[PDB]
Amino acid sequence: LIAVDEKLDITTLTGVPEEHIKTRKVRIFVPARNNMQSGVNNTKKWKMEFDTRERWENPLMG
Amino acid sequence: TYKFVNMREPSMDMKSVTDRAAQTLLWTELVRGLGMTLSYLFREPATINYPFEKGPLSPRFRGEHALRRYPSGEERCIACKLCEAVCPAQAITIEAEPRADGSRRTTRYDIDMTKCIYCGFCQEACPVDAIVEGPNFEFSTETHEELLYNKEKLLNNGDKWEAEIAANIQADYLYR
Amino acid sequence: LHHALIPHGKGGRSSVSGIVATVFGATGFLGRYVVNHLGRMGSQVIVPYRCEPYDTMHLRPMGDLGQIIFMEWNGKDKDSIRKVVEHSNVVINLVGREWETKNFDFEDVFVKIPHAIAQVSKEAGVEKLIHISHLNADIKSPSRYLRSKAVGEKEVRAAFPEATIIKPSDIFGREDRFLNYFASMRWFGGVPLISLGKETVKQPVYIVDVSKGIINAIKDPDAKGKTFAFVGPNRYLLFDLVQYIFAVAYRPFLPYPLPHFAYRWVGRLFEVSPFEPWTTRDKVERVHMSDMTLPHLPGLEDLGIQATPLELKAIEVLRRHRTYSEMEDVKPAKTVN
Amino acid sequence: TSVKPIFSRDMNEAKRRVRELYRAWYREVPNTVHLFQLDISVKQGRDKVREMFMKNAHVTDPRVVDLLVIKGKMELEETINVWKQRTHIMRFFHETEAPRPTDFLSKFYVGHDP
Amino acid sequence: SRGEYVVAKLDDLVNWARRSSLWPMTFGLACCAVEMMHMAAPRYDMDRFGVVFRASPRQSDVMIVAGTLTNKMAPALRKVYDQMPEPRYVVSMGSCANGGGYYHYSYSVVRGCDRIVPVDIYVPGCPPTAEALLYGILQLQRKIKREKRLRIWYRR
Amino acid sequence: TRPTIRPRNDVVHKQLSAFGQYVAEILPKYVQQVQVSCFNELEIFIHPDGVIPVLTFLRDHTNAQFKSLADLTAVDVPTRQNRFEIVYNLLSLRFNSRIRVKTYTDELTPIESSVTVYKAANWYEREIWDMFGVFFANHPDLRRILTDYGFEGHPFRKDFPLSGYVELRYDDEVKRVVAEPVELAQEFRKFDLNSPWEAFPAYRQPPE
Amino acid sequence: ELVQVLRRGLQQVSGHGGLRGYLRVLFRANDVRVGTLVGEDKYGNKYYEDNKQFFGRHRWVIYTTEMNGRDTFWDVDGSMVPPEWHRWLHCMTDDPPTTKPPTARKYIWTNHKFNVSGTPQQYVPYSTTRKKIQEWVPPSTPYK
Amino acid sequence: GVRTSPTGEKVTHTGQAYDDGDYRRVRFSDRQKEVNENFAIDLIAEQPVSEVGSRVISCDGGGGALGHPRVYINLDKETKTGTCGYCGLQFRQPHH
Ligand SMILES: CCCCCCCCCCCCCCCCCC(=O)OC[C@H](COP(=O)([O-])OCC[N+](C)(C)C)OC(=O)CCCCCCCCCCCCCCCCC
Ligand SMILES: CCCCCCCCCCCCCCCCC[C@@H](O)O[C@H](CO[C@H](O)CCCCCCCCCCCCCCC)COP(=O)(O)OCC[N+](C)(C)C
Ligand SMILES: CCCCCCCC/C=C/CCCCCCCC(=O)OC[C@H](COP(=O)(O)OCCN)OC(=O)CCCCCCC/C=C/CCCCCCCC
Ligand SMILES: NC(=O)C1=CN([C@@H]2O[C@H](COP(=O)(O)OP(=O)(O)OC[C@H]3O[C@@H](n4cnc5c(N)ncnc54)[C@H](OP(=O)(O)O)[C@@H]3O)[C@@H](O)[C@H]2O)C=CC1
Ligand SMILES: *P(=O)(O)OCC(C)(C)[C@H](O)C(=O)NCCC(=O)NCCSC(=O)CCCCCCCCCCCCC
Ligand code: SF4
Ligand code: SF4
Ligand code: SF4
Ligand SMILES: [Zn+2]
């Protein structure tokens, strides 16, 4: 049982590219209740999602 | 219950020993195999003369996709996107807007036939029986692009195969 | 720019580069590499072809779905030329031939066809025209090949003022006829050289470097109507270059001097082949002709491309010709530079 | 605070294992070049091994170092036994990827990516 | 022209042999390979068309990519395609070979064997019927019938 | 009778509960929890360091002859501190029964390999390592089994993208297959399908 | 007996209309069996039935020598049949189109088309939706 | 109602036609553009208007289970005709 005070960094082990590791801002939020419905069962767990990037149109089939 | 398949000790009497020795020296089982193969040679082959003869099919067969119309000529699809919701492979792309007369009709309806798995879920989920799997199965193409059907291609397929598709649906609509 | 010509994506296979390029003579060495680079960057490539469609199969994986379009064209048909350049904002001309056939000559393939392509492109609203020429292009050159290339360069410049004339010296690569031609002369006994090749200096350039320069010329706005000269970083004597080629190929190297008239007669002998000839008189003249030095014209360093020395990329081409692969070190050839 | 070790009780053993792995990789580069008929030189392979070792130089947790050296030993085992092809060895060398600029002006010109 | 007539007749003769005699190398990777066995079964009998049941890569002229092509498998497919001697044709059978099929968005699947090898014929289905594959083979045969190698060469 | 509702086997439920109490009493040092689901499945939650003793007991005990290792897998739950959940499914032919053993483990914590107890554990643990990153201490040969050679990342983790990071294609310039960053012609369409109304009141959690 | 088989072969020779017809059906269809004619479509295909054969060979089609604008004397496809005869030939029903005509619609194709891949009539995909965002057109009048 | 665009290209029923400066028209060179000649809107306009003597009328598209879900249309507002929106069929109550 060794002792260490590190901050549990698994960046080098996840395998994600450094670009997507260092240039990504995620949003930790509880999703808002959909106003079209009165149910509140989708607003109970926290969600982590990444920032939106570019989305263009395919030259073929659009 | 159970049974044994290879637990049977052969008899060691002189008659059986001589029979087994004759089987070893005189290739009895090999001659038997030759006789069976000769019988199969003299039997009639089971080959059909394609393409002049076609293998049997069923009204439930799933092949090339098609979009149908009403007897009045109006297309059956109402742009409900249950296609896109239920498609396992996400091979259907639908975009809709109100028509000039105010109808709820599609403006884009694309099926990627190279992504579709021909599972038949789209025609089960249609509330109006618009999208169907036609009986055609000989629509091979020489390029990848030609398998990216759009609304015009699907409507042309429906118009082309409407008679056979209607007959199949009439024959097999009571089981659904 | 058109709304559909605005670049998008991260410059990958599925992205839009905004470049619609009609590439003439794409079923060749440099055309193949250029089409590959355009497909990598995500452009819309139009490939006019005259040969069998089976010979265009290798160009299909280079582009995404619908990016590569194959259209049948005729060299002596301005109607087909217009049909294939009608919707492109870039036109690349790489049509060429080391020899002459019974229907096409050097003038036909280097003066007539390029002039028609340039003329139709100007009338079709094509924004950019890249035309490939030769570094040793001179009106009074000994070879009809270079004479016709110079005449065609002048005619194309006259027809399309805003043109980019690219003049590679001599391109070496996997499918080249420079290193493959030099390494395959072992069949004719010893290797024949004019004056043993000690008076000819060559500066070869990499196929990848040439293709990258062509791609950069399209994107760079300062090369609208210019003339470039793509040359390698080092200049080698012909004898030393052939010796290095044979050392890398691990083949027995025995050079012998051959008189100029005898070598021309030998080249004439090979021209009688109805198929592709091993060598021609014009090819012998070009091989034994020196490489012109044009410091005035800009080059790969001006376009942002660092030329690759022949020592690094020689092993790729010549590994095929090894017979035993032979896993022995080869000393670099000394350069005149 | 207190966790069980994997292979190294402290950083010294992890550094020793890193040095052993570096020696093993260094002694295998010419053999890898010869077997796979790579067009690169031995110096390029040594430099690439050095670069791969130097991109994890900021790791300070011994367990992460142990996992990294385990993965490196696995990759060396795949290379020695010629389980991989020339394809993967050249995949280590990003060769067909266009050089992405790292300056603000060029990033602004090309697109919306940060 | 007599030369034009002779080259046309020789092209017809050469294309007839290649069309009639096909020796395909079956790259059976997944469930699409079973339908190839059923095409070789007595009912359809691919042999009667001059299409041999199986052949080695050296003696093969057609490669039938039938199955899901993965990242761990693509180099082997490219290697065997390179080892095949020209003229060579490719028939991509099934959704997995054509595009991605059910596994289009997977991390370990090549989205179409056309990203690796030039495909001549695409056969749609999951799995394509044995009749569908036979129709694709006959379409490839009729495509070979339209080759004009000697006509192109004579007009060079 | 109720045709549309699955029958229940109280006898088997009681037998499984009794055996769970039995094993919990026998092994108090490692067994943390015992559960019996309503479809008659026994689950034993144990400490990660008691894997070898618990499996050896459940393999060699006279009343617990679970000679067959049915399956071995892991479940990734990011919200937990110990995200990885190693599950062992054991089959007893002598008593015609099945048992399930559960263990928790994070990224950096090794587990003792069960190749000594069960031989299928070799390939099962190789697959678990390849797909999640969980390390097994005493494995005869631990390496990637399913993923491509040189593959970076563990696909089955919940934080790994579905389409991955790289894709393969043939590049004519280098005359070989190359790996390039992934770029989809059509993006995968994420569908929000969860209804905003609670469906099962029996599983309702405290409001916190 | 062998004599009976030889007589049946000679009858098959005579059943196709002499020697030229027998050779034509032998070389362009690879089968010389004779069966009762069921009907003919508008393109020239002739559909025959012979229930004495085993299942899968009891119905067949002899294709026309010319369909649409393509010479199909040798190059015959399985997609050259109209949909109703296609259903009958593939045995999804026991009723020929002559006995059970398909329902007539004003939108159903009157002329059938085979697979047009590799031909100028091949299908080419395109986007069927309009442009999403309209750009701002600058004024045509100079400000100064 | 197949109409030809200024560039000589047929316009589909969705109002689709590539512009003059659009490079994407090159894909139709030496080939053809797939357009369905029958327009459903034109056909349904050609269809007549059924008149029934009731305030509420039920439409299932014809054929029973082979049509669309049955809907009920209120024929009260005499300004317009009640349109079944699945099949786009017009029903009206007699006035004169
Ligand atoms: C017992 C017998 C044993 C031998 C049996 C086999 C021999 C008999 C049958 C041979 C048939 C011909 C086959 C040739 C090969 C064709 C396919 C081929 O390889 O194509 C590739 C090439 C195509 O040429 P290419 O140059 O276009 O190739 C495309 C480019 N690459 C190489 C990248 C693919 O074919 C040839 O080059 C063949 C040309 C020569 C053959 C003769 C053609 C002309 C014949 C008429 C001449 C004029 C007659 C009138 C005047 C007479 C005056 C005297
Ligand atoms: C050991 C080496 C052998 C050398 C042999 C040399 C001799 C030449 C070989 C001649 C073989 C016979 C000729 C080819 C037989 C053609 C058979 C004919 O039926 O094919 C037709 C094809 O005809 C084509 O138009 C090409 C005709 C074949 C080539 C004939 C060339 C002229 C004769 C040879 C001349 C050689 C050049 C002479 C120059 C002076 C139609 O068949 P097909 O295509 O399957 O479509 C039907 C498909 N079905 C069966 C399913 C219905
Ligand atoms: C030309 C006419 C064609 C008509 C026949 C149609 C074709 C029939 C061919 C079918 C054969 C199939 C291929 C056979 C390949 C394998 C053959 C084979 O296995 O034979 C081996 C066989 C047994 O081997 P194993 O059992 O595997 O060894 C274990 C020993 N305890 O050994 C043999 O040598 C076979 C015997 C051959 C010789 C037989 C001689 C019989 C004894 C002769 C007695 C007469 C002596 C003469 C003196 C007379 C004194 C008056
Ligand atoms: N390669 C070199 O060493 C160097 C080349 N250059 C120049 O670069 C250009 C490209 O050279 P490269 O690719 O190596 O040569 P290739 O001979 O390999 O390619 C020539 C291309 O032009 C086409 N072509 C030839 N003749 C005609 C014709 N009559 N009508 C239509 N198309 C025709 C060929 O197509 P098809 O398949 O139909 O024959 C082929 O695609 C040429 O202009 C050459 O002079 C300059 C310096 C060095
Ligand atoms: P001294 O101890 O100061 O040494 C300096 C360093 C910085 C290394 C220290 O040891 C140090 O403190 N390092 C930080 C912790 C550490 O040791 N990190 C290293 C991680 S091990 C590692 O990453 C090895 C895996 C790399 C495998 C490379 C694969 C080879 C690729 C070859 C491709 C082409 C070959 C033909
Ligand atoms: S058959 Fe299945 S996979 Fe194909 S489009 Fe329909 S729902 Fe999608
Ligand atoms: S399920 Fe039917 S109505 Fe709905 S989108 Fe599909 S074809 Fe149209
Ligand atoms: S296309 Fe369908 S049947 Fe063929 S390999 Fe893929 S999943 Fe299997
Ligand atoms: Zn209705």
DSSP chain G: -HHHHHHHHHHHHHHTTHHHHHHHHHHHHS-----EEEEE-SSS-EEEE-TTSPTTSSEEEEPPSEETTEE-SS---TT-S-HHHHHHHTTS-S--TTTSPPPP-TTS-SS-----TTSTT-------S--SSPPPPPPSS---
Q: Is H70 on the interface with C (CB under 8 A)?
A: no
Question: Which of B53, B92, B159, B168 is the best substitution to test chain G (most G C-beta atoms within 10 A)?
Answer: B53
Check if the beta carbon of residue B107 is closer than 8 Å to that of residue B94.
no
Helices C78-85 and C113-123, axial angle in degrees (round to 10) = 50
CB contact under 8 A, C10 and D96: no
- Cα first-last separation, chain F: 40
Distance B22 CA to ligand 3 centre (A): 9
Residues with CB under 6 A from ligand 2: E 6, 9-10, 12-13, 16; G 27-28, 30, 74, 76
Q: Where are the alpha helices (DSSP H) in chain F?
A: 10-26, 51-60, 121-132
Beta strands in chain A, from DSSP E residues, in sequence order: 2-3, 27-29, 47-49
Q: Which chains touch G (3 or more CB pairs under 8 A)?
A: A, B, C, E, H
Phi, psi of E90 (to 5 degrees): -130, 130
CA-nearest of F193, F186, F130, F180 to F160 is F130
Structure tokens at F202: 């029996």
Strand order across the H50-51 sheet: H50-51, H89-92, H82-84
Widest CA span in chain H: 58
Single-letter code of the amino acid located at C43:
S
Which residues does chain E have within 8 Å of residue F148's beta carbon, measured at their own beta carbons?
Answer: 70-72, 108
Which residues does chain D have within 8 Å of residue F176's beta carbon, measured at their own beta carbons?
Answer: 86-87, 90
Sign, Cα dihedral of H80, H85, H88, H94? negative
CA-nearest of E60, E118, E70 to E90 is E118
Atom of ligand 8 nearest to the CA of E126: 2
Check if the beta carbon of residue C95 is closer than 8 Å to that of residue C109.
yes
Structure tokens at F191: 């569908």
> Shortest CB distance from C11 goes to which of D34, D96, D98?
D98
* Nearest residue by C-alpha to atom 21 in ligand 1: E149
Check if the beta carbon of residue B86 is closer than 8 Å to that of residue B125.
yes
Check if the beta carbon of residue C205 is closer than 8 Å to that of residue C230.
yes
Structure tokens at C212: 């990258």
Domain count, chain E: 1
Write the Ramachandran bin of A28: left for phi over 0, alpha for psi from -120 to 50, otherwise beta: beta
H or E segment to which residue B94 belongs: strand B92-98
Distance C321 CA to ligand 1 centre (A): 27
Q: CA dist B29 to B19, B32, B36, Å?
A: 12, 5, 11
- What is the spatial distance between Cα C154 and Cα C227, in angstroms, rounded to a whole number? 11
* Nearest residue by C-alpha to atom 8 in ligand 8: E31
The radius of gyration of chain B's CA atoms, rounded to the nearest angstrom, is: 29
Resolution of the determined structure in angstroms stands at 3.1
- The 3-class SS string of F7-19 reads CCCHHHHHHHHHH
- What is the spatial distance between Cα C69 and Cα C60, in angstroms, rounded to a whole number? 9
Beta strands in chain F, from DSSP E residues, in sequence order: 31-36, 42-46, 68-76, 84-92, 97-105, 166-171, 176-181
Beta strand pairing status for A47-49 and B148-149? Answer: unpaired
CATH fold group of domain B64-175: Alpha-Beta Plaits (3.30.70)
Distance C98 CA to ligand 4 centre (A): 8
Task: Count Cβ–Cβ pairs < 8 Å, chain E vs chain F.
Answer: 43
- What is the spatial distance between Cα F53 and Cα C332, in angstroms, rounded to a whole number? 66
Check if the beta carbon of residue H68 is closer than 8 Å to that of residue H86.
yes
Q: CA dist D20 to D13, D26, D78, Å?
A: 11, 10, 17
Nearest ligand, measured from the Cα of E28:
8
- What is the spatial distance between Cα F36 and Cα F44, in angstroms, rounded to a whole number? 9
DSSP states of chain E as a string? -HHHHHHHHHHHHHHHHHHH-B-EEEEE-STHHHHHHHHHSTTT-GGGGTB-S---GGG-SEEEEES--BTTTHHHHHHHHHHSPSS-EEEEEHHHHHS-GGGTT-TTB-S-GGGTS--SEEE-SSSPPHHHHHHHHHHHHHHHTT--HHHHHHT-
Residue H49 is part of which domain span? Answer: 40-92
B51 prior amide bond cis, ω within 30: yes
The pick from D6, D7, D12, D15 for probing ligand 5's pocket by mutation, whose C-beta has the most ligand atoms within 8 angstroms, reads D15
CATH of the domain at E26: 3.40.50.12280
Check if the beta carbon of residue C114 is closer than 8 Å to that of residue C120.
no
- What is the spatial distance between Cα D85 and Cα E82, in angstroms, rounded to a whole number? 16
G/F Cβ contact: 3+ pairs below 8 Å: no
Distance H87 CA to ligand 7 centre (A): 13
Write the Ramachandran bin of F175: left for phi over 0, alpha for psi from -120 to 50, otherwise beta: left
Check if the beta carbon of residue D72 is closer than 8 Å to that of residue D78.
no
Coil, strand or helix: which one is F70? strand
Write the Ramachandran bin of A46: left for phi over 0, alpha for psi from -120 to 50, otherwise beta: beta
CA-nearest of C121, C200, C128, C213 to C162 is C128
Q: Which residue of F has its CA nearest to C211?
A: F173
Residue E119 is part of which domain span? Answer: 2-155
- Cα first-last separation, chain H: 34
- What is the spatial distance between Cα B130 and Cα B82, in angstroms, rounded to a whole number? 11
CA-nearest of B110, B111, B132 to B123 is B132
Annotated ligand binding at E155? The verdict is no
Tokens 């905003």 correspond to what residue? F196
Give ∠ CA A22-A24-A29 in degrees, rounded to 5. Answer: 135
Q: Indicate whether residue B85 lines ligand 6 (CB < 6 A).
A: no
Chain H closest-CA separation from residue C80 CA (Å): 11
Decide: residue H89, CB within 10 A, 0-12 exposed, 13-18 middle, 19+ buried: buried
Domain count, chain C: 1
Check if the beta carbon of residue G78 is closer than 8 Å to that of residue E131.
yes
Single-letter code of the amino acid located at E125:
G
Alpha carbons within 13 angstroms on the beta-carbon side of residue G124 total 17
- The 3-class SS string of chain C reads CCCCCCCECCCCCCCECCCEEEEECCCCHHHHHHHHHHHHHCCEEEEEECCCHHHHHHHCCCCCCCCEEEEECCCCCHHHHHHHHCCCCEEEECCCCCCCCCCCCHHHHHHHHHHHHHHHHHHCCCCEEEEECCCCCCCCCCCHHHHHHHHHHHHHHHHCCCEEEEEECCEECCCCCCHHHHHHHHHCCCEEEHHHHCCCEECCEEHHHHHHHHHHHHHCHHHCCCEEEECCCCCEEHHHHHHHHHHHHCCCCCEEECCHHHHHHHHHHHHCCCCCCCCCHHHHHHHCCCCCCCCCCCCHHHHCCCCCCHHHHHHHHHCCCCCCCCCCCCCCCCCCC
Alpha carbons within 13 angstroms on the beta-carbon side of residue C24 total 31
Distance C25 CA to ligand 4 centre (A): 6
Chain B closest-CA separation from residue F164 CA (Å): 18
Q: Which residues, other chains included, contact F107 with Cβ-Cβ below 8 Å and sequence gap of 6+?
A: A10, A13, F83, F84, F133, F134
G101 prior amide bond cis, ω within 30: no
Distance G94 CA to ligand 6 centre (A): 29
- What is the spatial distance between Cα B159 and Cα B139, in angstroms, rounded to a whole number? 16
The DSSP call for residue F157 is S
CATH of the domain at H52: 2.60.260.40
Q: CA dist F119 to B118, C195, E29, E143, G72, Å?
A: 41, 76, 29, 54, 64
- What is the spatial distance between Cα H52 and Cα H54, in angstroms, rounded to a whole number? 6
F206 prior amide bond cis, ω within 30: no
CB contact under 8 A, F165 and A20: yes
> Shortest CB distance from D64 goes to which of A5, A9, A53?
A9
Question: Which of C87, C89, C127 is the best substitution to test chain H (most H C-beta atoms within 10 A)?
Answer: C87
Alpha carbons within 13 angstroms on the beta-carbon side of residue C195 total 11
- What is the spatial distance between Cα C24 and Cα C109, in angstroms, rounded to a whole number? 12
Give ∠ CA H1-H6-H7 in degrees, rounded to 5. Answer: 110
- Residue C241, strand partner residues: none
Structure tokens at C308: 């690759």
Decide: residue F8, CB within 10 A, 0-12 exposed, 13-18 middle, 19+ buried: exposed
Structure tokens at F167: 């894709």
- What is the spatial distance between Cα F84 and Cα A9, in angstroms, rounded to a whole number? 17
Chain B closest-CA separation from residue F181 CA (Å): 22
Check if the beta carbon of residue C158 is closer than 8 Å to that of residue C209.
no
Which residues does chain G have within 8 Å of residue H30's beta carbon, measured at their own beta carbons?
Answer: 120
**Within 10 A of F189 (CB to CB), how many other CB atoms are there?**
9
H or E segment to which residue D108 belongs: helix D104-110
Structure tokens at B49: 């003369």
Annotated ligand binding at H59? The verdict is yes
CB contact under 8 A, D90 and F174: yes
Q: Encode C253-280: b = buried (16+ Cβ within 10 Å), e = exposed.
A: eebeebeeeebbebbeebeeeeeebbbb
Check if the beta carbon of residue E109 is closer than 8 Å to that of residue E95.
no
Check if the beta carbon of residue G108 is closer than 8 Å to that of residue B162.
yes
- What is the spatial distance between Cα A41 and Cα F203, in angstroms, rounded to a whole number? 13
Q: Which chains touch F (3 or more CB pairs under 8 A)?
A: A, B, C, D, E
* Nearest residue by C-alpha to atom 42 in ligand 2: G74
> Shortest CB distance from C64 goes to which of F171, F172, F185?
F185
Coil, strand or helix: which one is D33? helix
Alpha carbons within 13 angstroms on the beta-carbon side of residue E129 total 20
Q: Which residues, other chains included, contact F85 with Cβ-Cβ below 8 Å and sequence gap of 6+?
A: F74, F75, F76, F77, F102, F103, F104, F105
Chain C closest-CA separation from residue G124 CA (Å): 10
The alpha carbon of C255 is separated from its chain's Cα centroid by a whole number of angstroms, namely: 28
Q: Indicate whether residue B85 lines ligand 7 (CB < 6 A).
A: no
The alpha carbon of E16 is separated from its chain's Cα centroid by a whole number of angstroms, namely: 17
The alpha carbon of B121 is separated from its chain's Cα centroid by a whole number of angstroms, namely: 14
- Method for structure elucidation: cryo-EM
Write the Ramachandran bin of D41: left for phi over 0, alpha for psi from -120 to 50, otherwise beta: beta
CB contact under 8 A, H33 and G126: yes
